[PDB]
Write a protein that binds this ligand. Sequence first.
Ligand code: HEM
Ligand code: HEM
Lengths: 54, 55, 101, 421, 220, 443, 49
Amino acid sequence: APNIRKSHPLLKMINNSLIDLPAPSNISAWWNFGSLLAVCLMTQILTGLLLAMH
Amino acid sequence: MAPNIRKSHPLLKMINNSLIDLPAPSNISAWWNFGSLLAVCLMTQILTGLLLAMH
Amino acid sequence: GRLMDRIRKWYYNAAGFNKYGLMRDDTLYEDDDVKEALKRLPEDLYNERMFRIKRALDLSLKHRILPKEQWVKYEEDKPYLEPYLKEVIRERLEREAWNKK
Amino acid sequence: PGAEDLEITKLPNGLIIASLENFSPASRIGVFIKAGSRYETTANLGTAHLLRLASPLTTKGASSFRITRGIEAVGGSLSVYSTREKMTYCVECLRDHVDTVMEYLLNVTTAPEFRPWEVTDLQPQLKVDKAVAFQSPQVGVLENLHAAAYKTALANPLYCPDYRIGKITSEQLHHFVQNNFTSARMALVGIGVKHSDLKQVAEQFLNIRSGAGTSSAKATYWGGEIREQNGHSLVHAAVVTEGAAVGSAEANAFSVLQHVLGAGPLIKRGSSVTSKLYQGVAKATTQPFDASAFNVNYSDSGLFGFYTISQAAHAGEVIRAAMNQLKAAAQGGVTEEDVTKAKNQLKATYLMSVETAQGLLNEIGSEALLSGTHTAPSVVAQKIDSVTSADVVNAAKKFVSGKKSMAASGDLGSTPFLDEL
Amino acid sequence: AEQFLNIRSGAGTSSAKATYWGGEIREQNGHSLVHAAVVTEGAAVGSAEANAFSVLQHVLGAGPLIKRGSSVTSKLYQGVAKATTQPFDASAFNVNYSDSGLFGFYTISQAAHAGEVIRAAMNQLKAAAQGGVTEEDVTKAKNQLKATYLMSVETAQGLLNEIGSEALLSGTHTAPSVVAQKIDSVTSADVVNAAKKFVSGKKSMAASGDLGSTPFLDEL
Amino acid sequence: ATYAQTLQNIPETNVTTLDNGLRVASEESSQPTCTVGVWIGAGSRYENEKNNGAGYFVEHLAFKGTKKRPCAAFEKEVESMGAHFNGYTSREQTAFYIKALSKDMPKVVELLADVVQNCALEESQIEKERGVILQELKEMDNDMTNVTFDYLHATAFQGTALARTVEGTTENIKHLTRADLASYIDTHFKAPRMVLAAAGGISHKELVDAARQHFSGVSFTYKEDAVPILPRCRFTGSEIRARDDALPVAHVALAVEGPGWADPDNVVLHVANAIIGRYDRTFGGGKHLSSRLAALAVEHKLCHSFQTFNTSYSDTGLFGFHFVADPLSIDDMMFCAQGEWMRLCTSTTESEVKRAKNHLRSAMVAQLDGTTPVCETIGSHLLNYGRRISLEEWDSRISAVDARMVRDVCSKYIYDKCPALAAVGPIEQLLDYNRIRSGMYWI
Amino acid sequence: VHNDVTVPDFSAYRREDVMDATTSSQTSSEDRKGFSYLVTATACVATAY
Ligand code: HEM
Ligand code: HEM
């Protein structure tokens, strides 16, 4: 209330860091690695679990 | 600014916010002790577990 | 002598922050001293600095710069903050020496 | 070493210097100025107030920081008191530190910088400073009184009007100082010090020009009536008429008439029998109350009358009973014995008022500023008893006759209008 | 009204008749424009002495009739213009209450020209108290008055207020015909009379703004 | 003419005792005006549970007339000589004094004597004052600061006599009897326990002759000459929280048992309280104020004001601080306050004590700014310290104090001590005695 | 009025050494504190072990 995007204990977080998060209007490509790094971590963990199974 | 570093620090602000200045009913009984025991069990299992997984 | 005086003009053009329309003072990193200075700035000066900056940020996101004709000229660069900043730092040093006293 | 003497050099430009070594272990210097809220115009209303709270801002020779740290370092103090037409800056500290504190006192009264930021940062204090002062109804009504009693200069409030909190510029502060803090309107008084020293500083450190810079547009009398309905159970009221100016011997009559009518109890939780007024009102009301003889003496005018505090309902009786009590005195209701007692109370009050370091220093410099002289407590005593039984009943009449002003506040439900007294 | 309404009956608590004071309240506030209003007791509702004032009102001028006009038919306005240089506004104030009333003029002007605008409005009112009223002025005002009134009842609210206001004060209903008579029955004299009752009677005054150049009641 | 010297110049305070026990003392100045009064060693601490409020009820009558000179007779005689009579009554010290022309020095003493000895106690007036005191209570009850200190004593000295208010109970006021007020006077207002002090243009000799004349008490048995020793009051680390979320600000006072008049540490305690000082929203100083707490208070809008204090008593005392704040900054403020206390015990710097000592001396001097204050110091010194203590002495003592000393003494009275707490108003934020008790150590 | 407020009696809970309202509680303080802190100190020793 009003929207459930800013109030909900959990969404308030996804919205607070990946949606309404204020960011400089000029950050370049050299700022894309933060998430790529994150994606790598996820990808590694995921393929890793898959491998650890065998 | 924030005087003490217990309520300002991005991390301590949390330990203090949930395990020190956290408001709690004055009357909760022993039946409220399991939440933490449960947490301690989780920690103990994980720990002894890693130790076992090593062999 | 007039050595670094021309050296300076060289560096000023080499740095290039003027291709964005910024003055030397605009590019200053905002540590404590600078933030305090910025506070004392008369409003016009402050509002102007803002626009200069906001325009530069827009230029950066765009990957463009001002037309050569609008670049600030080494001798027309206004150190609008420099003095305020001096005082601020001067003021602080005093307190500091005094508190150790 | 016993008692010395009160010197008082009067330098060229006009800066007066009056000192007095009383060997007290503590000194108390102070720059009395002919400044004040009366010199204000609709244009810079309140600047005088804000200047009063600017005392701790940076000066051309001492930073805001060093001023406060410096003084506190020696256990010194810095204060600024001011009436509608008088500003008194002044420090106080153990003898051995007068030099130290002097620089700051000096720098403050003559070297202000009024830096834009330091200033705008300060103006919110007006908000606060005013709120506390106004906690006592005593002050609220008096502001309004002056507003009604006059049309200008003295009609200006002592506390910056609200609408102007935050609109007072640095220019206004400077121009105010430049146009009023002039060597000829200033007096450097001191205590627990030798004249030779206090003088030295005055001439070796002061620079500002002299001449009343901007003079005040003489106070025109209005005879207003301001009423502030606010619910507050206790009703404060003050009825006055134009009085006597400074110096004026006529003023001495009122001082006596004052103590004759009664100027606030002398015995803890007393009854004040020696108080005509008090006594009169009691015989009129049933509930608790307080009523006194009001009296101020300003440069080009004055105010005189009575101030009462009572329950809302008994406002009518307490106020009127205070009028008749003043007429009865205007109609020979004064005994030669009444006039003699008041003359003592007066002599007492005065004499006592100068026991405290501030009381004495104010007594000295007040005169040393108005007429670069110094009446001896001996002469002052004469001017008092020279008041005759007549003079008193005269003042008494000048009141019942003259046009009055009135200020009130509270649940004014049972409070009378000026045209009902 | 009947089978549905209810509540107590009888005038319940009556009001303690209005006593006249003739005060003077000044509000210093910086605001560049200085508002001011000077009045005297006028006529109460119903009283024929009112009709006069209503007419004297429109005679002196009660707010322009032409968009961004000049108000020539307005004695007061016209009078003040011939007195000041800068922009301003001045009109004929008039209220009629049950046991009393208020009448005078309300002005708005620059702070500095407050003195002239206000005083120019006083003389403008005395000149009318001293035969400064033409039988032609009195006839024009009687139309403006007839017009204003007549128009005011075009809107649903206007008419409902007109009706009920009377229906409440005297449970009757004058026809716009009768009201019209009461107007023109006002004589050139009546008007200058009211005009005098103003210059003579005790006044009240309210102001606000940078009252720097604003005069006190005892200066008009 | 350096400070040091001006000190050793101030005329000595003379003291002479009479056969009845009365002690007359004075400091002679050239002052044309003066102050003289009798400082009795009595208060609410001497009252017990049945008469709590006597000394205060009696205070209300020592001015409504004596046997010889009834109401008007008294007031008239006094008002007409341009004199100011007034007094007070604390927990363990009561006083009555006049401000008159040095000329009237001897007539005043007569008057003083007539008050402490022949109070009319007109049973008619009594019933009136009864309603007055009851009225003053309604008022004083709206003085948070008072409510707060009374409460402070109420719990810090709970169970003892020092835990009572001076004004007494609503019941005692409603029921005290002429007889009660009577005996109160007889039992306490006694020569060996009173002190006739004076200051101004007065001859000590003239003063004492006048004393001999009206202060002619007689003493037959030893009992009469003896000064009783009060039973010791037990301090208790405790707290009393009077909560009312309806009041604008909240008051908080915390303290530890202090030593008592006699103890020399008091000097050091004062020098310490001098460091932390006191503050208030109208202190021009601002962010630059020397007291860290004050400074912190300013930087964080922690309180409308705060003040340290070292209230001494015969055998005990209260060393603490009091602050007024908004409901939501009570904790930060309390935190910072205890912070400075812990800093006092662990890291006081020489620079601090230097400033502190100067500030102290200055206050010490202001304690003698007029015949009345000076007089008050005499009456109290004799009464408390036994003799008079000259600024030259105080100044001496003060100079001896240094960082190390402040730390040792403060540690001694503060560190790891169970404090006494009193809180009033919207005090929900400040909380838990334990959390506060732990603030007493390390910082 | 706040004058009618008294702290209740805590004898049922007070430590024997601070029961007497006429004895400086201070003399027994070092013990009261010494004892409790000892318990704690011991607990630490045990946990440490
Ligand atoms: C920080 C993220 C990770 C990194 C940087 C990483 C890196 C590596 C590397 C360099 C190797 C050797 C690859 C090779 O065979 O040449 C490896 C092997 C392996 N990792 Fe990870 N790994 C990550 C996460 C995980 C996780 C979370 C798991 C599963 C719980 C996992 C399971 C394995 C397994 C089963 C192997 C051994 C067999 C193989 O070489 O494929 N890894 N990993
Ligand atoms: C949610 C917490 C955990 C629970 C409830 C749990 C429960 C169990 C149970 C019931 C067994 C069989 C025990 C037996 O031999 O009788 C077991 C075995 C084992 N667990 Fe866990 N476990 C926990 C966490 C972990 C973790 C985090 C690890 C290591 C990453 C771990 C590693 C092992 C290993 C190595 C064994 C097999 C050998 C053995 O039985 O000792 N466990 N666990």
